[PDB]
Structure formats: C-alpha cells, structure tokens
Scaffold this active site. Structure first.
Site, PDB file in Angstrom:
ATOM      1  N   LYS A  97       1.121  35.706  42.145  1.00 43.29           N
ATOM      2  CA  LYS A  97      -0.104  35.801  42.924  1.00 43.29           C
ATOM      3  C   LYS A  97      -0.407  34.431  43.520  1.00 43.29           C
ATOM      4  O   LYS A  97      -0.937  34.332  44.623  1.00 43.29           O
ATOM      5  CB  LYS A  97      -1.276  36.231  42.039  1.00 43.29           C
ATOM      6  CG  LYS A  97      -2.630  36.184  42.754  1.00 43.29           C
ATOM      7  CD  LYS A  97      -3.783  36.553  41.819  1.00 43.29           C
ATOM      8  CE  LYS A  97      -5.116  36.526  42.555  1.00 43.29           C
ATOM      9  NZ  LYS A  97      -6.266  36.847  41.659  1.00 43.29           N
ATOM     10  N   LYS A 146      38.204  32.233  58.136  1.00 35.10           N
ATOM     11  CA  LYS A 146      37.523  32.344  59.418  1.00 35.10           C
ATOM     12  C   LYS A 146      37.893  33.660  60.112  1.00 35.10           C
ATOM     13  O   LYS A 146      39.046  34.091  60.063  1.00 35.10           O
ATOM     14  CB  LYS A 146      37.878  31.161  60.325  1.00 35.10           C
ATOM     15  CG  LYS A 146      37.153  31.192  61.663  1.00 35.10           C
ATOM     16  CD  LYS A 146      36.862  29.790  62.181  1.00 35.10           C
ATOM     17  CE  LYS A 146      35.917  29.838  63.374  1.00 35.10           C
ATOM     18  NZ  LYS A 146      35.402  28.491  63.746  1.00 35.10           N
ATOM     19  N   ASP A 173      35.797  33.729  50.402  1.00 32.81           N
ATOM     20  CA  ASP A 173      35.514  34.686  51.460  1.00 32.81           C
ATOM     21  C   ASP A 173      34.268  34.144  52.149  1.00 32.81           C
ATOM     22  O   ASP A 173      33.512  33.366  51.563  1.00 32.81           O
ATOM     23  CB  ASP A 173      35.110  36.056  50.895  1.00 32.81           C
ATOM     24  CG  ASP A 173      36.281  36.897  50.432  1.00 32.81           C
ATOM     25  OD1 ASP A 173      37.396  36.735  50.961  1.00 32.81           O
ATOM     26  OD2 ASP A 173      36.060  37.757  49.549  1.00 32.81           O
ATOM     27  N   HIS A 263      26.104  31.292  46.355  1.00 32.86           N
ATOM     28  CA  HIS A 263      25.967  30.957  47.769  1.00 32.86           C
ATOM     29  C   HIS A 263      24.487  30.782  48.112  1.00 32.86           C
ATOM     30  O   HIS A 263      23.626  31.477  47.571  1.00 32.86           O
ATOM     31  CB  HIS A 263      26.588  32.051  48.639  1.00 32.86           C
ATOM     32  CG  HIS A 263      26.854  31.613  50.045  1.00 32.86           C
ATOM     33  ND1 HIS A 263      25.869  31.547  51.005  1.00 32.86           N
ATOM     34  CD2 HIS A 263      27.988  31.174  50.639  1.00 32.86           C
ATOM     35  CE1 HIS A 263      26.383  31.089  52.131  1.00 32.86           C
ATOM     36  NE2 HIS A 263      27.668  30.853  51.935  1.00 32.86           N
ATOM     37  N   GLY A 358      34.743  24.044  54.582  1.00 33.00           N
ATOM     38  CA  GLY A 358      34.219  25.249  55.200  1.00 33.00           C
ATOM     39  C   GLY A 358      35.188  25.918  56.155  1.00 33.00           C
ATOM     40  O   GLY A 358      36.402  25.873  55.956  1.00 33.00           O
TER      41      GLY A 358
HETATM   42 MG   LIG Z   1      -3.248  40.238  38.832  1.00 33.46          MG
HETATM   43 MG   LIG Z   2      30.003  31.626  55.767  1.00 31.09          MG
END
Ligand SMILES: [Mg+2]
Ligand SMILES: [Mg+2]
Lengths: 412, 412
Positions: A97, A146, A173, A263, A358
């Site tokens: 909350k 890729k 992957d 990830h 990468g």
């Molecule tokens: Mg509450």
């Molecule tokens: Mg990616």
C-alpha cells in the site's frame, strides 16, 4: 527481530508524522486506545520509526513538481512476526500500500541474519560457476545469439559453434527467444550440448549454454527438471516477469539443481524513477542473490543508456558482499560493451565479473569467432599487465575491434 | 496478427530512429543484411513502427532533466508468432529490455481477438458477483478489518459481524494480514463463514468475506482449492507481488472456481512515473481483467493521494468495456473514501462499482455498524434522487458522518 526498510520520501507535509503513520498503520494499526493488557500482547507486532535523515529541499525537484517538497530518508522496523517467511509477504508488508502513497521510493531492506537463513541464496555462486566452466582467475566472457527468432535448430547449432570457437565461456538465448516447433526447449538443450562438445573436441575450449526457461509458471518446475535430466548447463530466467518467489522455488528444487541466470528484463519498470519504485541495488542485487540467482545481468555504467556508476557498483557490491549468508552471485554489467572497454570493466568490477559481449560479438568484421577472439585477447592483455594496443599488435581480431570501436581510456 | 504496444518516449535524439531500432532489435534483429530466402522466412516475425505522434517539448521536463527532451507517443507492432501465448512472454517482448532503454513508459497494449481468446478473463465478473452477493442495481459496499495483526479468531468473528451488521456487502482481510497460528487461513474461512451466517439470520443481510490468499507461489493452488472446499466467498490476492501469470493460473483452475479480488499492493512501484513504468489503465485495468480478476481495487481520484481523475476513469473503462471478450471486472476506487463522497463516486463510476469504505468505516462515532449504515444510507439517497443532507436529516448514522467529513459537491 525486524526487517528495517529504508525509504526516500518527498512530501509537502510533515515527514515525521507520515513516517509514524506508516510504522503504525502498516503494522498494528491502533495502539494508544488499547488497554495495557493488549499493548503488552501486541508490543511485539508494533512497527517503529528507526531514523529520519532530513535532506535539503531540491530546487530542481520543487520546480518539477511545482511545489515545495521536503525530502528525507526514513527507516522503519517491521517485526518479522507480522508476516510469513516469503518474498511476496516481505514486499507487500514493506512496499505494498505504501507504494501508492505519493512520493515514496524503497532504497533498501535489511534482514536479521536469522530471517535471511530462511532463504537459499545462489546454489552455485561465483565459485560454483567458475568450477562448472573450468575458468579461474580471469573474468568470464559471454555472448548472446543474434536473430534466432524464426530460425531452426541447424542455424542454432551453427551459430552456437561460431561463438564457442570464438572462445566465449558462455552463450545464452536472447531473452525474447520463446519455445516453438522450430526451436523446442529440450531440443535447444540436447542439440546445443552436442555442438558444444564437438567444439571442445577440436579446440579444447569448454563453453556453456544458458537456455531460456519460459512459458507458464506452473509448468516451469517440470521443464526445468527435464532440462536438468538432459544436462542443461544454465537456465536463463526472466524473473521480473514471474515474481521473485518463483526464482526462489526454482533454486530450492533439488530435482533441478542447475545454475540460474537472472535477466533484467522488465526491472526497468521499477528502478529508474527519482521519486518512486525500488532502487536497483535492492531489486537487482540484494533480492536476486537472496532468491537464488547464480548470475545477475544488470545495466552497465557504459554506453547509450549507462546506469549511474555508483548505482552500478552498488548492485555488484550487493551481489558479492561476503557479509551475507549466501554464496556470491556473478555480477554481469550488460549493454554498451565492446573489447575496448575491458580494461575499464576490470578496473570497475574486478576479476570476478563477466564481460558480456552480448549480441555485439556478431558485429565484429570477422563474425562471432573474431569477436570472441578480440574479447579474449583483451582480457588476457589486462591480466598480463599490458595495454590493449600492445596485444592488438599481435592479435588481428583485437586490432580490428579497436579500429572499429576504439579503446576507452582508463587513466584517471 | 500482432500485439500493438503504445509507448511514451522522451529522448534528446531522434525518436523515430530509436523507435525503428526497437521494432527491429526486439524482433528479428537485422534485416538489410539478410539474403532473399531469409527475408521471406523472417518477414512474418518482423516488428514495425505503426505510428509516431510528436508531442513537442516540455520546458518543465527539460528543466528537470537539464536538457532538451523530444517527446512522442510511439506505436510498435510485434508479431504474435514471435512469442508463446502467456503473459510473461508478452511483458518480456513488449517491455523487457525496452524497460531499460532510458525514458520509455508503456501506455497500452492491443491484441487481436484471436490472441485474447487464449486468456480467461474474470470467471464471474460483475454479473456473477452481484448474483453471489444477491445485490443488483445499487453499487456494492465493502470494508476492511482494522488492526487484526496479532489478534485471534474471537476478535476476527466479532469484528466481522460488526461490519456485516453495518450492512456492508463484503469484508476483506487487510492485505498485510498473513497466516499465523492465531489466524490460520482455513480457520479464518470456516469461522468467518459461520459468523456471517449468524448475521444473515439476524438482519437478513448477506455479507461475503474476501480472505487473503498468501504464501509461496507453489502452495497457492492447494490452499485455494481448500478454500473452495471450505466454501470461501472470495480470495483476496496481492497479484503484483507474484506475477500476472499466477493470477491467470488461479482463475483457470476448475478446482478453485472462487471469485478473485486483486489488490493494488506494489503496483505503485510501476505506475506513478511520468517517464517510466506502465500506465495504470493497462497495469491495473486491462491486464488484470484479462488475467482473471473479478474485482480490481485501484487508487481512487479522491483524497490525499488521489490518482489523476482521467487515469482512474481509464482504469474503470478497461475493467468494464463491453468490447472485450471477457466478463466485466468490478472497479473498486480505493483510498480517501467517506460517506460524503458517495454521490461523486456514483456520478464518476456509475452503479456498477463498489464503494470501498476501507478501514475508515471503523472511524464512525458509532463504530463499523454506524459507519456501514452511513454508507448504505448515502447510497440509497443517491439512488432515490435526494441530496445527502436531505437523507441525513432522516438518518442519524449518515448525519454523524456528514458533520464529521462533510459532503463533496457533485454539480458540474
Ligand atoms: Mg490494507
Ligand atoms: Mg536480448
């Protein structure tokens, strides 16, 4: 025993009043009007404001909001007897909350050691991963497939070999690669495994494959168990799209027991704001390590969308701090990475990190093989105490990379 | 067939260039470097920038960032053949890596009808809930327990009956109420059910109890199934602390088949920013309805932390739009609610909404019973076409509430 949450608040009204309101409202609700007997009974459940560090008003912030906002760091203690020992309860208690209450950002959560012990931490961690891939001392090197969406297994195996032949330690992957008839989960694992062993047979290099574990939540454990039976090396997992508790469940399942690579996908919906959300050191660092991630990929402090350096370092520190009752998770600064950045990466994050080439590894003039060779040559240079260009003079792959992307200066 | 995502982008560089890079990078990766055979093979997987609406720069935003930021609403189409038919894949594909790309905020998602049909929608919806509670035409009234943490079952049943005697249609656990030895999940359900049936015998009023469904993800189905066997009325669920997929799983389990009330806890870590995150109409509205929520509690446009009015209305529209292949979910504006706001709530949201008295119902001079009577009288007054003050002159409970909190003008 209480979890201490640290928050950053911006508000037009009295911060102390708001803090006290949170401590009481998010715990026992009422106190003053309760009879002595009940107070003693509910004392253990009562939240308390631990500290309030007043910050200076920010003209920049006031101008943005068009009003005067007082700023302060507030720490509140939440008795652990108030909630069950699980991450969803923790999040709802400390930022449920409250996340809806105007300008409030969760900066950190400090757990009593005894409470932490109810959580797993990484199953393998840095030490375990280094043994699994057989690489000690030097930082690891990883790359990403890729253009695999819509492709077949033959293409997958071909692309995987090129990356492995380039000397990378791990290939994963793309996080957006989902299961299909062309690329079934189990087939990526078995076909990939066969291909990688062939590479070891010829070059003597050992390379792991982190396969994307996707699909519906209640089908994850069964497919992960199958992956384990098939000998999958690592499971790539888009944790933020599933919930921290799911990562923990995968980590605690003894029938899986396969390394897990977390990830950062979707984490950006929560971490960037100056006034809301959850700080990356906590969301990507502390919580992912405690939940069971052996690897944590996070926004690097380099490139087009570089994360503020101290923020990036803070994530790495949370992942590796030896004061925690968990194994260390591998810090993997991702995005904006190229060979010319290796010296800075090692200087910033140390040797126990992974250089994430990468998908950029494929952009090397000579493809992934040349790209991997460039990265490996760069890593060796730093460990050999030589400037990249000195090694580039003896390694064509590295020189081509340097001429294509340059070298980032590390001299202060 | 493609999911079209609408984003708000802020960037100092060309927006169209960035957008085209996203559409390509997040789908097939490369295109112009592909042979004819591969291009025709991957054509169906290629994402595309559908439209770009330039918004012009904001001096306020520019001042905040300290630079000139171009602004635009960008629409990108992602082929559905690119990912599996599940919410985690949807989020990762449309806002995974993209959530890390500087200033990008996800505003909406549109799906082909055929893709939508792969999801459940609410099991009961507005029509079903009205039947189960036995209240048609008038908006419903709900309240929340006050300070139950650390309390026992004798207190639970006592407080439950007080609220039901006040005439509320539904009472829910506080979202921070977790299972304990004092208040076990199954006991709250069985004892609460017995206490509520006593109230019906007395005043003829039917009141439902929404019990908090908490704990670890992989234990949720089992306990939810037990709740059904025990006759639980509604399951309160802190969905944002888990994942959308978990809500969907609970909805699709035929062994549960109990109404689900989604709580907004933690949604605030994602929705408030002007530059990042996901818009509430999508995060709290469209996706929760599609995933299976029968009720959705969301930040009301009233009070100290009021959600901008059009945003709140946007959430309600997503929950009830009859154009969707899902049953309508009950919109429940929450926070800042008091009897004096009933006329405005009904004017803003219509008859098919729920007036959430929250824990504030206990703040009425005569306790929950009086607080509930005040709200019921307020609702009756609006439906009878009478000013609250006119009805208050004939109803003590309401008069007390009005003198205390006042009446909010509804005249345009
Ligand atoms: Mg509450
Ligand atoms: Mg990616």
């Amino acid at each position: 025993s209480a979890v201490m949450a640290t928050y950053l608040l911006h508000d037009e009204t009295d911060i102390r009043k708001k803090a006290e309101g949170i401590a009481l409202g998010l715990t026992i609700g009422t106190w003053t009007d309760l009879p002595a007997l009940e107070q003693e009974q509910l004392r253990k459940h009562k939240g308390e404001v631990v500290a309030i560090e007043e910050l200076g008003e920010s003209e920049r912030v006031n101008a943005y909001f068009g009003k005067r906002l007082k700023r302060a760091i507030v720490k509140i203690a939440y008795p652990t007897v108030n909630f069950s020992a699980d991450l969803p309860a923790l999040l709802v208690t400390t930022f449920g909350k409250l996340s809806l209450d105007g300008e409030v950002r969760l900066l950190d959560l400090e757990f009593p050691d005894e409470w932490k012990r109810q959580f797993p931490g990484p199953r393998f961690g840095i030490d375990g991963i280094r043994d699994r891939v057989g690489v000690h001392n030097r930082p690891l090197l990883m790359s990403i497939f890729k253009g695999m969406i819509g492709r077949d297994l033959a293409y997958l195996t071909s692309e995987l070999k090129k990356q492995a032949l380039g000397g990378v330690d791990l290939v994963k992957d793309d996080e957006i690669l989902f299961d299909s008839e062309l690329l079934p989960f189990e087939k990526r694992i078995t076909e990939g495994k066969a291909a990688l062993q062939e590479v070891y047979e010829q070059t003597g290099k050992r390379t792991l494959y982190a396969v994307n574990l996707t699909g519906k939540t209640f089908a994850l454990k069964d497919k992960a168990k199958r992956a384990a039976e098939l000998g999958a090396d690592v499971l790539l997992f888009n944790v933020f799209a599933y919930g921290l508790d799911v990562l923990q469940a995968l980590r605690e399942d003894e029938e899986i027991a396969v390394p897990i690579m977390a990830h950062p996908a979707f984490s950006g919906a929560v971490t960037p704001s100056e006034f809301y959300g959850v700080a990356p050191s906590l969301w990507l660092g502390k919580l992912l390590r405690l939940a069971g991630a052996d690897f944590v990929l996070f926004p690097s402090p380099y490139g087009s969308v570089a994360l503020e350096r101290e923020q990036a370092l803070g994530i790495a520190r949370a992942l590796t701090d030896d004061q925690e009752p968990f194994a260390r998770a591998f810090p993997v600064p991702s995005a904006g990475i190229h060979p010319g950045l290796v010296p800075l990466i090692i200087r910033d994050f140390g040797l126990d990190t992974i250089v994430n080439a990468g998908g950029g590894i494929h952009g090397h003039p000579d493809g992934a093989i040349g790209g991997g060779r460039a990265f490996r040559a760069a890593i060796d240079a730093v460990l050999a105490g030589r400037p990249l260009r000195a090694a580039a003079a003896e390694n064509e792959a590295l020189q081509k990379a340097i001429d294509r992307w340059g070298v980032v200066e590390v001299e202060a």
